């Protein structure tokens, strides 16, 4: 008895008709026994060939997570379904999330599968789930319900969030919660047994809310106050080469595209013959002074860099060998709002996809907190490589944006 | 009396209508067999006649089919497949013998007439109207329109695909004892049943079926093996591909080439050693259809490699998943691998290759890891699980290669096999200057307009060198002052040029590349001992940069 709410398309665009991709004998079991359960519960129905619309669907499980959780790929479909900014059903973001202590994220997703789906608009969600060897023609499905990933439904449920919450949110005025996608973002600044403690009473606040109308037991835990930024070093080294200044040359002519205040003509002056690159040249009186009004404005922030909400987010990343991993995220080139270096992360010294996917999972959480979008990745990485692998490290409930790139590191400009 | 298969709902185009096409020119031997046909067709309730009120029409027309005296009709029902929506197509992939475990009992069955056995959808029956001339459009001629799936369009492939398979979906479920492959009106039924059970579950199938409108006639009915299924012949413990034909004509054109090289693919699965490298060369360019390619040496020497594995006939064997995969590469030259997959010694479930020349600079570590990657994608569709691979690279190679590299890369679980050629990497920069060794500055430039340039070198030692250079580019000239600084230098060299295009290049360790330049270079690479590249920007005023820039500019 619950009314739909109605949705729509972007003007001039057509559903989403993404192959399926192939998938491993474990996961086609996970989806055929959940989507066994889901129609059953009549979350999702059968469709047929007449609706020309597919989405792909694998599996996946969380972080210290043994069991399966459905994953839809609904990238295409959020980007062309309507802006619910406009519709005024878009989530607000909260600049204090990223202050606090300590922050859980909570996977509400389960609780779409309450609210129905316009009619209308249910043909867009359709999927199907192949099976080993093609035994079988693709099993074709549609969603009934608010599908978990879909953009559209944390919008069209925040109405009902904001009520579960309420007598949470007035008991604990200090605690903040934002919603993204399938997520809960909970942070405070309590301490941590305190904190631990608060979560476990949202979700029996959860369960009240679950008696009366993957599972909801899991949760991460964050700690934005720590987290901390990887600027741009210029090395001390005591005697220099001239391989040393030529490296400095280039990286501080690289760096003049982000500070304009660099000057590299003093130190060019040491280079003034042709010399062999072992050759040790001292600094002149000149060029020290410059080396160090050089690390000064290195130290001090980019003018006129800020964050535009009406700007999508790009990240880049580059892989420094021996596990080391550094990373840029900027809306306009050149006016970077944070950069950052992971190191020893899963996969460290035998596996590079899984460092990278682990180092895209941390990127794009860190970039819902703090500014409440995903940013568009250029991933250093060969497409085939990718495809074939990177499914079999995700681990979060979202999928964002990539493309892929060449860019040899002619200098080691985020890494020494 | 028959069970009705609901119809599928089926749309146009939005804002489009139906097909209006005139009948083509049509012979009379043409015009005369198929007004024999029409009338059938309406008998049997697959076509109804009325007309006047239905302004659609779709051209009708007739070819012999193969080798046989009869007469087939076929609707060019191209204009309705463009203003019919689109479907999404069910049948992903296409089943591989080798994902077949081994069965006690086997079936192999057909569906009689598949598409016209299905109702078309009440409201999009009068678009598929046609027309045919009467005698030589004399008189005014009989109007149809249909009533099932009809062949050559769009939707009746989905259509059918989709109903087969929720007939289907009762039996499966309550006789999980059976396995049953369908493709398209075709049925593989196996079980560990005995004969007689078998016999009699696929009987209990044969009438289910006959419920819904759907014969199985005996012709089709395959009892005895070998069973003849999507193109091989599976006997109970080893399967084989069909015969193959290869052309064997003296003078080749562009497109019995063509047939031959998709013959060799075909043949690929099962037959360990194909090559087709230099078979598809020869049809590199705008070669038509019809012109005489003469045979290089090299093509004829791999067409005659191909017989020879191909005289022998081989067969592969089936599934076992209590057994792990073992997939094993090995290299064959000129970028061209082959692979076999097994699981136990010398008995392959199947087999394949790997040929594709991807970028004009590469070398054997990238092609491998793309070969790993193609041979894990196989596999996961035919058995659902990645393989154990058995590479010719040892660990220490591929160690280096993938810790050095600044892409990210990965190989799955994997083990050494001593299977020569191994692939190793020729040449490996060193990370940090070379005391001691001479250090080049390189620059080149090249005149945009009249494409003259210069590169040279100048050197810490005083050693200096300007070539001219004539049709070129300020690339190649980049690179050939990388060349010259490699010819000229000793076993150990610093070289220091502002070219990110050649550095970008040459860090990537290409062991071959369609640029001569590029392979004149890597054969220097590969003959000194230690060598150093450096980049420094351009017109910064730096050391030798600055000099070795006027030289080749001005
Ligand atoms: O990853 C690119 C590859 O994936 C496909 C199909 O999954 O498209 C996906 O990747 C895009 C980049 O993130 C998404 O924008 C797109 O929506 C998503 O489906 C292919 O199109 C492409 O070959
Ligand atoms: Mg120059």
């Not at chain 1, 000057?263 to 600094?283: C, D, F, M, N, Y």
């Not at chain 1, 002074?289 to 535009?308: C, F, M, Q, T, W």
């Not at chain 1, 941390?362 to 495809?387: A, D, M, N, Y």
């Not at chain 2, 999009?124 to 459009?137: E, M």
Request: include cysteine; glycine fraction near 6%.
């Amino acid at each position: 008895p619950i009314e739909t709410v109605p949705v729509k398309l972007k003007p001039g665009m057509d559903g989403p008709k993404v192959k399926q991709w192939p998938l491993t004998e474990e996961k086609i079991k996970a989806l055929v026994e959940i989507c066994t359960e889901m129609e059953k519960e009549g979350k999702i129905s059968k469709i047929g060939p007449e609706n020309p619309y597919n989405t792909p669907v694998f599996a996946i499980k969380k972080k210290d997570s043994t069991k399966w959780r459905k994953l839809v790929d609904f990238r295409e479909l959020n980007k062309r379904t309507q802006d619910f900014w406009e519709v005024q059903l878009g989530i607000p973001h909260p600049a204090g999330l990223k202050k606090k202590k300590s922050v859980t994220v909570l996977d509400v997703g389960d609780a779409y599968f309450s609210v129905p789906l316009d009619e209308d608009f249910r043909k867009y969600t359709a999927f199907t789930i192949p099976s080993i060897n093609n035994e079988t023609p693709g099993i074709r499905y549609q969603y009934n319900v608010l599908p978990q990933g879909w953009k559209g439904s944390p919008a069209i449920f925040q109405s009902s969030m904001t009520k579960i919450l309420e007598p949470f949110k007035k008991q604990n005025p200090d605690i903040v919660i934002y919603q993204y996608m399938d997520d809960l973002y909970v942070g405070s600044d309590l301490e941590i047994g305190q904190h631990r403690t608060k979560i476990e009473e949202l979700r029996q606040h959860l369960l009240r809310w679950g008696l009366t109308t993957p599972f909801l037991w899991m949760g991460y835990e964050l700690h934005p106050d720590k987290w901390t930024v990887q600027p741009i070093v210029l090395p001390e080294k005591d005697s220099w080469t001239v391989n040393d200044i030529q490296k400095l040359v280039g990286k501080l002519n690289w760096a003049s595209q982000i500070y304009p205040g660099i000057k590299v003509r003093q130190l060019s002056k040491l280079l003034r013959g042709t010399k062999a690159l072992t050759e040790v040249i001292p600094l002149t009186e000149e060029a020290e002074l410059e080396l160090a009004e050089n690390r000064e404005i290195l130290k001090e922030p980019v003018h006129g860099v800020y964050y535009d909400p009406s700007k999508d987010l790009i990240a880049e990343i580059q892989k420094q060998g021996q596990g080391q991993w550094t990373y840029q995220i900027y809306q306009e080139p050149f006016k970077n709002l944070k950069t950052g270096k992971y190191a020893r992360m899963r996969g460290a010294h035998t596996n590079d996809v899984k460092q990278l996917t682990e180092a895209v999972q941390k990127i794009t959480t860190e970039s819902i907190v703090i500014w409440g979008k995903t940013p568009k990745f250029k991933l250093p990485i060969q497409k085939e490589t990718w495809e074939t692998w990177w499914t079999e490290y995700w681990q979060a409930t979202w999928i964002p944006e990539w493309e892929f790139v060449n860019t040899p590191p002619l200098v080691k400009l985020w890494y020494q | 009396p028959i069970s009705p298969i609901e119809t599928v709902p089926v749309k146009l185009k939005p804002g489009m209508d139906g097909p209006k096409v005139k009948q083509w020119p049509l012979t009379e031997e043409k015009i005369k067999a198929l007004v024999e046909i029409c009338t059938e067709m309406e008998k049997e309730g697959k076509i109804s006649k009325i007309g006047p009120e239905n302004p659609y029409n779709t051209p009708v027309f007739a070819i012999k089919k193969k080798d046989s005296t009869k007469w087939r009709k076929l609707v060019d029902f191209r204009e309705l497949n463009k203003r019919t929506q689109d479907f999404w197509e069910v049948q992903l992939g296409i089943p591989h013998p080798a994902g077949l475990k081994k069965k006690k009992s086997v079936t192999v069955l057909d569906v009689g007439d598949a598409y016209f056995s299905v109702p078309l959808d009440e409201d999009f029956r009068k678009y598929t109207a046609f027309t045919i001339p009467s005698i030589n459009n004399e008189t005014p001629g009989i109007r149809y329109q249909y009533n099932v799936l009809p062949q050559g369009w769009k939707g009746s492939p989905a259509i059918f695909q989709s109903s087969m398979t929720k007939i289907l979906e009762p039996f499966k479920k309550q006789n999980p004892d059976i396995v049953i492959y369908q493709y398209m009106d075709d049925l593989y039924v196996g079980s560990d049943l005995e004969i007689g059970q078998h016999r009699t579950k696929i009987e209990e199938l044969r009438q289910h079926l006959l419920r819904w409108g759907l014969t199985t006639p005996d012709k089709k009915h395959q009892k005895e093996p070998p069973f003849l299924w999507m193109g091989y012949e599976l006997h109970p413990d080893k399967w084989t591909v069909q015969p193959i034909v290869l052309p064997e004509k003296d003078s080749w054109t562009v497109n019995d080439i063509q047939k031959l090289v998709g013959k060799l693919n075909w043949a690929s699965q099962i037959y360990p050693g194909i090559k087709v490298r230099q078979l598809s060369k020869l049809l590199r360019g705008t070669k038509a259809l019809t012109e005489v390619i003469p045979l290089t040496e090299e093509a004829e020497l791999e067409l005659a490699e191909n017989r020879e594995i191909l005289k022998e006939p081989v067969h592969g064997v089936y599934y076992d998943p209590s057994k792990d995969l073992i997939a094993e590469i090995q290299k064959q030259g000129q970028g061209q691998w082959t692979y076999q997959i097994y699981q136990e010694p010398f008995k392959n479930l199947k087999t394949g290759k790997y040929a594709r020349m991807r970028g004009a600079h590469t070398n054997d570590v990238k092609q491998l890891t793309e070969a790993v990657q193609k041979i894990t994608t196989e596999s996961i569709v035919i058995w659902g699980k990645t393989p154990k691979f058995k590479l010719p690279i040892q660990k220490e190679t591929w160690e280096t290669w993938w810790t050095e590299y600044w892409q990210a890369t990965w190989i799955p679980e994997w083990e050494f096999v001593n299977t020569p050629p191994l692939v190793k990497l020729w040449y490996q920069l060193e990370k940090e200057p070379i005391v001691g060794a001479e250090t080049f500055y390189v620059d080149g430039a090249a005149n945009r307009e009249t494409k003259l340039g210069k590169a040279g070198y100048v050197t810490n030692k005083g050693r200096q060198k300007v070539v001219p250079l004539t049709n070129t580019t300020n690339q190649k000239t980049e690179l050939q002052a990388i060349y010259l600084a490699l010819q000229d230098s000793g076993l150990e060299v610093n070289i220091v040029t502002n070219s990110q295009y050649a550095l970008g290049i040459i860090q990537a360790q290409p062991d071959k590349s369609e640029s001569e330049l590029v392979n004149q270079i890597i054969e220097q690479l590969i003959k000194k001992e230690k060598v150093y590249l450096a980049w420094v920007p351009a017109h910064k005023g730096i050391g030798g940069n600055e000099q070795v820039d006027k030289l080749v500019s001005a």
